[PDB]
């Protein structure tokens, strides 16, 4: 999926979309391409345990430093464990093995921290009407955190102004959450034709570099 996104992104940025004679950004909206999932909270404890996160459906997950993943569903009980090689197992907080006891308490520790401290991003957006993804990989730069979900989506949160990109290669689309927390979803092909403001074009050039890095990290 990332090769599809990199090309979608490569075409748009080739358009010079902020250079249109008359930018018509709103003409590039497609409200039915809104994503189903995005990362609504995250905690980087990677010096000790790994990266904990919340998805917009109130499920939570951890990508441990040993490259394993544990997800808790929003029912608060069902777990999915994903090993380094991608092998997937279902367990529950009720009925689980003892070998995961430490990782489950780390998840609960992350879960508790996020509910006590953190604002849920996009809480006013209803997701589109889907298999629950996990965090495949992530990295931080000095200006943003980059989050790659198992369903193909790439999210980039920008630290300075709290703006966020959600890129979906299945829709050839991007969602931009701006400084005022207003969200707009765009078909990237339409952003090529109609153009966009300099701020968004700046973010999309950055996004291309980030997707190159994700692709090269495979």
């Amino acid at each position: 999926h990332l090769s599809d996104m990199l090309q979608q992104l490569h075409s748009v940025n080739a358009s010079k979309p902020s250079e249109r004679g008359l930018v018509r950004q709103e003409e590039a909206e497609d409200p039915a391409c809104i994503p189903i999932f995005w990362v609504s909270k995250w905690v980087d404890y990677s010096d000790k345990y790994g990266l904990g996160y919340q998805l917009c459906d109130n499920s939570v997950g951890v990508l441990f430093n040993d490259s394993t993943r544990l997800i808790l569903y929003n029912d608060g009980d069902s777990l999915q464990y994903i090993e380094r090689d991608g092998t997937e197992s279902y367990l529950t907080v009720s009925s689980h093995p003892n070998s995961l006891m430490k990782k489950i308490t780390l998840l609960k520790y992350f879960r508790n921290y996020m509910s006590e401290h953190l604002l849920k991003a996009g809480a006013n957006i209803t997701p589109r009407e889907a298999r629950l993804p996990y965090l495949r990989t992530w990295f931080r730069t000095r200006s943003a955190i980059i989050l790659h979900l198992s369903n193909g989506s790439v999210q980039i949160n920008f630290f300075q102004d709290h703006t966020k990109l959600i890129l979906c290669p299945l829709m050839a689309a991007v969602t931009y959450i701006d400084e005022k927390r207003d969200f707009r979803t765009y078909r990237l092909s339409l952003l090529e034709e109609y153009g966009c403001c300099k701020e968004l074009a700046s973010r999309l050039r950055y996004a291309r570099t980030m997707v190159d890095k994700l692709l090269s990290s495979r």
Partner: peptide
């Protein structure tokens, strides 16, 4: 930061 936007 080491976590997302706090309340």
């Amino acid at each position: 930061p080491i976590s997302s936007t706090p309340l």
